[model samples]
Target: VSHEVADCSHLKLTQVPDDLPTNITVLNLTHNQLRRLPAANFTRYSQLTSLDVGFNTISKLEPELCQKLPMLKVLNLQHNELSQLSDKTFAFCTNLTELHLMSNSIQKIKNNPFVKQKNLITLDLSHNGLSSTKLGTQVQLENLQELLLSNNKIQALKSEELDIFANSSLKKLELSSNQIKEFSPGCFHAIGRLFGLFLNNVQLGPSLTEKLCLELANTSIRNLSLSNSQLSTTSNTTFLGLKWTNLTMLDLSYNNLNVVGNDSFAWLPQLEYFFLEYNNIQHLFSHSLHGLFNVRYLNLKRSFTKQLPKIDDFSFQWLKCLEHLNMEDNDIPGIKSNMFTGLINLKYLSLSNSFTSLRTLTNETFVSLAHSPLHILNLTKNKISKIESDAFSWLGHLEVLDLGLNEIGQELTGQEWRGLENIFEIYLSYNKYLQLTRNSFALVPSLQRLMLRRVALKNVDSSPSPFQPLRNLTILDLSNNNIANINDDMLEGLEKLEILDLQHNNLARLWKHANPGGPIYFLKGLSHLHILNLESNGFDEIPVEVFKDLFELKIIDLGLNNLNTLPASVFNNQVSLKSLNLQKNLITSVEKKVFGPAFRNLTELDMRFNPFDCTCESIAWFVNWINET
Candidate 1:
């Protein structure tokens, strides 16, 4: 006897609370400013079950408030302003189960609006303003299970509204984002415990037939989202409501589905993820997807596919549990290395942005998932100029490798990074002419992130000792290269250097004996230097102990450098500086404790495209220490 609490959310309630509360089960007067529902205000919840007056500004619901919810089950009057619901207002919920009149303004649903809820199950008349649903009751709802008529303005579905749920006890049916074009033939014959069917963005065309797939072959569904359903063709009774031992996820991504004939999935044998990304599928025979034996993720991205039709090793040799294969953007040209010979449990193989006339690639086209447990290999945008040195000698458990945008030319043939000895992360950015000789990265001994940006290298020369055996090298992006100078053993064997992107390279100087003769390297052997980009380099002067062994520097761009003055130990022993770009530098004046005390934890100081004098003793004490921090 304690259930009457009303704060009437944003008020202006139109009716319902006439001292309401007689064992009120649960009622939440949602977002308010309601319009109507006062038909004697639900006789004070006569043993009410659950009621939520959804987003208000309501429109109607009087029929004696559905005979005062006789032990009502659950009714949420969704987004308000109701439009229609007068089939005796649901003839008095004879134990109604769940009914949510979603986004109101309902259009039609005249007949048996639950003619005394024959034990009603679940029904959410979705985003209202409906156009049709004249269920003239035949077997009515013999305990309806789940039926959510998605976004509406229903296009068609009256054969007595599919003989009023053919037999009832529906399981799961969501007429996905709708504009439904047809579905008369026994409208899913009272759904024999339908499993899970969401006709993704519906538009079902091509005069859908085959007796409407044998009335959805007496249900046994298992996740089937027919993406953007404008289905162009598919017969063999288009999956007749799948049941070959319970289907698995099968989303026919955005469709106009071009062709898929070859016993179209011979009775889907326990199919797995087979989402055919945007479709118009050009070609893929060998009896296209024959008897999908445990498939695993095969999304043919943007399938206006220009090539890739030679696949027939018994068309995916009964896919022994295939794993991840997304042929990104299509037009795939070459790939005959025993076309992924029975993908021995393939592991992620994306052909990033399809190969626009792929220039070449044959390392036994991925020696059939390189003896199994394949790991991340995305051939980022391609025109792949050449890569023969065992084009990745059977990827020994390859790890993160994206040959970012390609044209990879300029000879660097020292067994092109010999058999990627377990590479770590190598993305050769926007490539064209990238030369890396000296032991050309001797079979990567576990290298880590080396993204050579805009590879137009003019010289990264340390004469000929191209820094051999990168003992665990750490992030080195020679930005927009044509590097002019950096000879300090040219960063000799990058002793685990941390983030060094010589921005827009043509680097003017940094060679205060760069590293002439390594070994006694202070600052804890370059103890994990933080970030350093020397933006658009041509440095006018930077020597003052050359950033004193960068005590863990934290971000310092020196934007478009030609710096006018800044070497008072340039923020000596950089005590973890935080963001200091000095934008387009040539600084007019800034030396009063010139960022002394190493910029007391500086936080974002980008003298916007610098050149400032704004004198007043250059604003005494740096404008009072930036207004007292």
Candidate 2:
């Protein structure tokens, strides 16, 4: 009878539906195969305020079931087998405020189990088997704020267990992957409004970071994560006892840090995101970044630096608003000097693939980021052979540039394409024999995404059409170039191309319709082409006006191709097709006017290994259009 909101989920019901509802207020018998808890059917559903018997196999939970719903407030017994927890198991809902007994095999936590949940604020006993003196000891909950004891059996945290949140109101504390090896510092002296503290994979050491600086001295902890605490160091009085001037985001990346001193983080200069990625950090000195001057997202990615990470010149000139600098796999390759001196609000930079001795990028290799503000630059998988053509002339407000899998083969100049004027996306995918010139991307004319994947974009008759000054190009991936001539002004400056991957190239026949002035008639300027991949281009035939000259063709992957008969207006203008992959094709009989009504916006149609000649009028019109779609 439950009405106000009841969705007895996945009715594999083995119990709990005694015509549920008695002024019910949001009750969901989720993934049910209920094992117990008919506790007088929730004592006549005392107006339950959000209750979900989550994925149930509910093994006994009658501790007065929140004293028979004393106006319950959000409760979910997650995958239950509810264990020992006492105080009559959360005594009685004193206006329960968000409680999800996670997975539940909950170990005893008697004392004052949730001290009458005085308007409790989010308490998820993660996985459960609570330890540290049974996760209770004179506990009190006056609006407790977020305490998700992650995969518990919390081996430590008992400074007399911080006298049970001694004077409560916690602010997000997730004891992550706990097996928390011994700690005291008065067990974080009663978390004073702590702001996010997740002990990632705790098996903590390095002398528990000097007992977390003698137990988080007055914490206002602004996001702290001792990530993979296999700590090698956290020195400098390891933040003289927490609340390090109200830290602002800190993650000593996957610990075992090698060298880090010189005032390690100088106790948060109001740090704004700092994670020394997979630390084994090398020199890096420069007083370890003098004082993070209000950092702005700095994650030195995978710095297992065996060398070359040691920078100086007041190392990053006190990160003047450092903006997203993820030095991917810190192997450090080039930039021999000042490495971004005084980063003028540096905007996103990644010396990708950490240059295994990166080959070249001249103009004095990024003359110290030529006066900053560089936007998105990842010299992808560096080993770059040469790049001097004014090596990105002082990043003219660059927009996304990733020299994908480098070793630049040749032919690309305009002094490396004249000062990319407000560039678009450019990731020269996996470089190889790249002899582009049809105005090889005519000096970045606001180029729109151009990834010459497996770069070998051959010269099938070049005529000043290096993507003819990209007419605001829209995604053009010339997949695996094994060119077989494709003319018509080599795609006359792609008339606003929209996703076109000439899958495994060697174009056989595509513009079979535009003949008068043939040679791949530029497929009549694609007219806003919409998703088209001519998979395994061993094309055999396809021109019933090939999707009516692609009038906004939608999703077409002529899969693993070879000759195949397919003209009944080969999907007439593909009426905005919604996914159509003619998988492993050869010959097939699918002519009911080629899915008549121009395949009413087909919702996914993959012809799995087709041999379909199913006659009988093709099995009675494909089983009557599969009973009306």
Candidate 3:
């Protein structure tokens, strides 16, 4: 007898088990040695709704199996050894909604195998050896929404072969990874409501592709992808056949395109997202992208060869409605004037890894985008080292600036950040050392998050409250900077800071009692701090009063230190602590007086890799707590 849901998988059985409850609704018998599903085995499980018999050695399914269990809705026979199917396969499964027959050795299917499955919504028959597109000689899939037939050997599509879906509700069809090389003149004319089609990695030559586009004229298709189809050239009339359709999105990635002819996509005026990524385009003339007036997002990521594509001035002049433009990984040299002349509504632009030779950002660098509403600029890994004063003065609406992994060390002057009044986040990590003067960030007062990891920040003590102007700052990351010391007033103005990361630094002597400098209370004003990471700083001692004001701290990491003893009241005020890491230290024992009351709210306490004194008096409470919990 079985429960409502039985999992007898991986049992190595040659047949269905005889011990199943009659009212079972879900059964999983996958990864077994069954060679065939006998119809008599499922006669008692008529209440089953879902059955998983995948990953088995079954080569044939009982033709009358569904007649025994009329309540079946989902059947999975994937990764099986089935070779053929007859019309009576699922003749009685009228209420079925989904069927998975993928990754099978099926080469032939008799007519009308699923004629009674009118309520089916999705059918996955991919990874098979079917040579034809005809699911049946004459059948009707009235409610099928998605049909995935990719990775099949189907070579051609004819109108008569697909006319069976004329009155059906099929919306999305996947025929990718096939050898389709021919398309009858009106092959898709019958499927009037088809919206999305995937034909990637097919053998559609230039002429066959043109013929296929002409056949999709009267349909309601909105998205079409012809990527990796060996399309080497595109002329003005290449997409002329799509003029009669309401195509909005097209993907032509992973091809051998060398050039983009002017007005080549003029017929698709309603296109919103155009993906030409992973192509070998060589150049972009002035009118190359002229006709797409309504396009909103254009993706040209890695669309060119190693020799950067020579882009003419005003290349994007007609794309007035463009909002997001991605040209990353293209390795273009520099930005020229009037190159982005007409992107009036552009908001987000990324040239990351696209400009290794662009060194300086003169005031005229973005002169063409002076009137645009640009907000986010990602110039990561561009090897840029200098920025003339007021280089970004025109970007008044800019909010985020990412200049990580560059050589920008000398351009942190107060004037370099001039018109970024609305800026909030700036990423300057993994660059050469940044010298922060008091006026470095005086212009942008609305900053919230700043990352300076591995910039070797040792000048914070020299500048008098360099980050004083950032009153709204919340998250500050200064980890891995090799910082040894900081003045008492180093973090004077960061009252709103919540998360501070100073891990992997050289602050071992900051808490010494014999130091000449006065007591260093660098984290004094961060009362709202929630997470603090001081791991791997090589500290030998931590004063008891250092964390007195950090009562709101939730997660603190102090692992990998050289401390042999911690004060009894070091964590007295951290009542909200949830995770405490003290692993890999020199401690011999954890005293109950120091950790008993402080760990009331702690959930994750790691003290591994420590020299624990294994005596009953020194570690009795810790041993009992570990065993009891």
Candidate 4:
């Protein structure tokens, strides 16, 4: 070999790669350990399209270096250790499209920097540790599309510095996120096509989201997101110029959105989705969601919603295509009959976990849906006590109904349970009911899931009928009831009882004679007996042979029981056990091999909030099990 290359990580080579390829179109040696570039470095790279040696230990670039690469289109020396650029630094790159020297220790740029680069499209000198830079005579960058000079130790942008690019083709300018607090309006007067600007997240407040929305409303930019920028409380007159029909998406989430007047969204005709989540919105007046004809998705989650005022008859008359609505975690007590009157084409309606004290539903509430199509209705965690008969007369095509965790009283008026002919699924669990009348669900022939928990039942009524004739009932929840005993005859009619929740009842012990028989006795008919919640019960211990009957039990909640410890063979033949909740009990700890039999198919073991001794090695096994799972 003529010469062998040495280690280059720490070499202070002033000259570029001596063996540089002649066909190289781009050369990037930025932040290298070099002090300067030799003029001969560019002599062989005549076709280089881009050259970047910025932020290195370089102090200067030879002027003759630019003259060597006449076709260079991009050059960057930003954050470099350069103090000044000689006239020859940009002498030959006439077709350069971009030049960046941001964060550099530059103080001046001679007229020669742009004397030849007439086709330059961008110039960035922002954040260069300098108070000012002089644009010598004949400073013109006509084709510049963008200019950024932010976050430097400079106090002013002198008129002379701006006159250089007076006819700049800059469409986007960013002088924000810096210390340029006091600027004259004349600075932006020369920017012709400068349509987009960003002065947000600075010292501006309420007056900005409006001021900027107006100032740039006439521009062609379509999208905008002003989230978490500390916007001031907006009024009707705030968004004056934001009426551009071309504007599409507007993100005003996470702001102090306490009040939005009736006419706030009147001018925005093309807006599709409005995200008002995580704000201080308390009420949505009538006609509040009006004027937004094309809006499809509206997010009002966690918006501190306490009530929905009486909407006008024509409230949502224009929102014909709305598909999704979110009113989660609000304090809404009840919904009027025509609350969603005009929203005929609605598909997904979410009213989950709302603090609702609504006890009854009128026929008018859902009768209007007869003319439109509605699929899902979510009313989870509400205080619904009554469902007036014919309440769902118009919802003949309704599918899923979620009415869980409510304080429903024992007033099952026959009229309240009518008109649910086409219902598919109904959830009535976690209520205060003790027993169900035989005709309570005679109208719903398609009832699938019946969840009845924390029931105060003492005994089944014999005269009227113990349970309704649920021909399609597959799941029944009688958990947390006060029934001291159960007979096989009590559940004789449930031929399709797959999952029966008898946990937390007054049964002091388990006996084989208490099990159901007939169609219920056939294990195939109960193939879906997967989830069972028997936590906080009175059983001193679980009999290993009792669980042998449930061959498909997957998730079992047996924590907080009277048992001193679990039997080793309690879960012996249980092959499908996946999750076991054993939280809040008086167990000291478990042996290493105690859960070996149950760990085969176990996916989760929750023993939190329990009184386990610190010295027991069982805690290590528990931690390991949690980590492994």
Candidate 5:
């Protein structure tokens, strides 16, 4: 009594399902090996509304494939071997509003390809061999709103071939990744709602560039993309048309622009988004984009002059309303207050970026962000030796401060980290000597995640008040924190610390620390700690009861240490130790009955990489223990 939907995607079917329901309203035979679709297969499904047969080896489809499905609204034939289409190919698909023929060898379109599809709103003919003259149809589709002829072999545009779109309702025309040029504004005179014109990879010399601007003078085209057009320079009259049009978003990335002169973009006043990333514009000045007063976002990633992008006072003074600036991978030597003086509303800023660059940061580095609503500042991977105390006092509302991967460590004192106002996440990994004395993080009262990999804090006594202010700290990553000296009190007052990373810092355990046997209270008050990483440390042997207080410890890493032997009683108190990595140690022997009841909770025990001397007395008891257990 009811029609059904056959769910058969990725079924590895060699042909269409023959025993299907006759009253099916939808059929999805995608990702199959159906080479051809005969006419009689779909005749019984007259009520079909959508048909998806993409990702198949279908080379040919009968003319009557859609004859019986008069109510079909969507048809997908993408990723097939169909080479051409005749006039009557879709004669019966008059009710289709969406047609997808993308990724096909559609070299010829002899017939009025979509003659009967009067209600078609979206037609995809991308990745085909279509030139401007052989565009198949003089037919009109008044309701067509989105036409995609992108990635085709079309080099030019003709008026007669586009006359059908004279009074149509097209809104989005994505013709990017094509071999096209000389298609001027006359070809786009009809559609008033056209908002997107993607012309990526179209060549444009001075003459061709000026003509394009003249034709699109007063159009409503809001977003225009002309990326990879080999545009080195724009003539005086080229951008004169943008002053009159309603254009707002202009993407000129991946071009050959070498410099931005005083009149580079002096005409585009109302533009808001300017994307000029990945260009050869090694040189720039203050007035390069002076006319773009309203532009909000500017991306100049990796766009450096042959020399460093010298910044005078008024370099970015024109962009008063700028919000986001991504100048990553530049060779700018330094930054000053007046370099970003007028950017009071800037929210995000990135500078002195890319690894392998040496530089220092002082308090005056970001004095310009004193009034802006800036929130995020990324200065990672720079050769930063120091950052003065008040360098970040102006960005009071800043939440994320990324200063990871730098040489910003002369003394590692908290005095240089004085004014970090409202930060929550701090990354200080790969710095060798980062001092962590009293009040080092006195200003960052709301820090949640702190990363300090391969680093070393100051030799301050971390017994009771090292991280006293970090009561809310959740993740404390101190992996390889330059533990050249074995100090048990290094992680003191870290009761709330959940994850502690002490991996590969040459860590050692001292057996004689003003005690009779040894000090087993190294990691005190870390009750909430569940994950611990102490791998690659030079621990000859960890004393018994070292981790007795950490009852909640679930996983531990003590691998790559110089330990010779380990008694199972050493881990007798670690009842919650679920995963332990004791591999890569120098342990060569095991006791007979060391696998006692306390080792039952050890789910994953890694005893690999230990050079164990195999002999009857060396391993006979351990081998029999495994047989008995």
Candidate 6:
């Protein structure tokens, strides 16, 4: 009754709860045992504008049920046992704008069932047993905008079935997951101003697809998806009839397209976003993308077969306005110098797991991208092992470069990262032999975030601080490296560091051997640190002053370790602590005097899998505190 909304759900209600306040405007009667809705049951809640009766056993709706609720605007009757609806079903609820009838046993809808709902906007009838799209033949439902009829038994679309929406302002229509194989001529002419249409998972042949596209000529449809429509090839005349429409996005992925003739998509000059992933096109001719002059985003990920796709020179020269391109998981051979000759406006490019036999990255590898203002370049999971001097000297405006999961480790001579003057992040994880030397990242001085997990790094204890040149560094991840120890001056230059992850290492006695019963101050300079992770490190005890300077710490993960006891004042200075994870440890009991003051601001504490004694003196405080909280 606080916001004039009554929630009477999940009470196994056999009928309406008559004890609800009469002034409530929203009632949620979902997940109940309602079998029928009588007219006298809704007389008290006459102010209801939104009602949800879904997930019930409602099989019948009384004739005069809606006459008592004249102001209802939204109705949800999904997941019920409704089997039929007549014209007088909603005769009095003429102000309804949104109706949800999905996941029901509805088999038939009598003609003009929604003839009185002139202000309706959205109608969802998905997951039903209706075999036809013949809703009504009356001049009604003029303000409807969205019609979703997916997951039904609809098979064909005739011209006169949807002729009632000739003057309606319908914008989107979803008919996906239906085995629609037949389309009468001029079937979509009634809804000529439809903006978005989805026909995915329909088994339309090439000629039928062409027929569908031809029928959509001169319409206002901008987004069209015909994915998995059994298209094997796209000749020049496939989409020739849709050249007059203002189409901007098209999804043709998940098809069997093995060959694409020249000028296949030249008709769609206004198309901007094209998705053709998960196909079998093994080659790209020179004029493959000949006329997409205004395209911005193109996705061709996983669109090839066993061998590498043979891409000719200047294959993408027509896409001069492209910004983002994804070609991941395809067997692309190598990055030739002239492969990306005219992509001057490209920014984001991903070729991860694409190169089949690429080994060396010489200075002339990416010389063609000298003028493009690229931002992110992902080349992870390749066979690249060597990089010559100044290999990345052309891309000066690049920000993020991901070279993880590759074989380029010992060949990094610090000169390969020279020209990235504006780089903000770099990822170099999962290459087992990657050893960071003293001058490894000296050239890229503007780097802020670096990821080096599982790279066999044992060089943090070296002199001069291998990460000293990165003065603007904030986050560093060096987890799963099997590193044993590090000097006290290891984190000297990273004063602006915020997050540090060193989990799953072999640092069992680094604190005992470094200072010998004194406080471990390896994290002394990182005063602005916010999160620290040290799980599974085989620790026996931790010093109280290990987190003395980290006053801004919010999360500390110390789970899956071998700690026997902790000092009472271990987290005394962490006044802003939010979560402390201590699961899977060897502790016996948690005393209130040891953790009460430290957990003043803590909200989450995980102490599962610990060997705790069940004596009254051992856990009596915890049992009382748990029950109170």
Best by TM-score: 3
Lowest-sum lDDT 10-residue window in model 3:
615-624
Off by over 4 Å in 3: 1-3, 614-629
Q: TM-score for every candidate vs. truth?
A: 0.38, 0.39, 0.94, 0.57, 0.80, 0.86
lDDT of 1 by residue, 226-267 (tens): 788777666555775454337677787888688777766777
- RMSD of candidates 1 onward, in order: 16.0, 15.4, 2.9, 9.9, 5.9, 4.1
Local accuracy of candidate 6 as per-residue lDDT tens digits, 1-629: 23799888887999898888898899899999999988898999899999899999987677677788888999899999877888877777788999889998677787888888888999989999888777898667888899888888989988788778877766778888889988788778876367888888887857787778888888888999988877788877888877878899999999877777788889889999999899988788888888888789999898766566787878878888889989898887887777777888899989898779568778998887887888999989887787677888988999999988888767345788989999999998887566666687889989999998888885776677678788888988989998886767778878888889889987778755355655346788778888899898887678777887788888888888987577787777788777777778887766655566556776767666677763223222222234312
RMSD of 3: 2.9
- Give the per-residue Cα lDDT of candidate 5 at 573: 61
Q: Over the stretch 1-629, how does candidate 4's per-residue lDDT look in tens digits?
A: 11121223334545567776677777776656777777786787787788877657767777777778887788878767777766677776677889887777676665556766678877787766555434546547778777665555554444455556566656655554443333333344334444444443344455655655555555554445555455535555555566753555555666656666676676667767767676666555565665677677777776653445222454555667777777676665556555577776777777776555566666766654565466677777767766666877776666677777776666554455576666767776666673455566667767777666664644543334344467567787777776665543454455566666777776544432343441112222333467767776665655445555555778877776655466667666567888777766666666444466666677677766565663233322233244322
**For all candidates, what are the clash counts?**
2, 11, 1, 3, 8, 0
Q: What is the Cα-based lDDT of residue 70 in candidate 2?
A: 78
Reference-based lDDT, residue 443, model 2: 80
Local error of candidate 3 at 409, Å? 2.9
Candidate 4: count of backbone clashes, pairs at least 3 residues apart or interchain: 3
Which candidate would rank higher by lDDT, 3 or 5? Answer: 3
lDDT-superior candidate, 2 or 4: 2
Q: Tens-digit lDDT track for model 2 on 131-227?
A: 7544566656756788888888888775576566666657788888888867666666665466777888786766776576556666677788888
1 or 3, which is superior by TM-score? Answer: 3
Error of 5 at 472 (Å): 3.5
Ranked by lDDT from best down, the candidates are 3, 6, 2, 5, 1, 4
Per-model CA lDDT versus the true structure: 0.69, 0.74, 0.82, 0.62, 0.72, 0.81
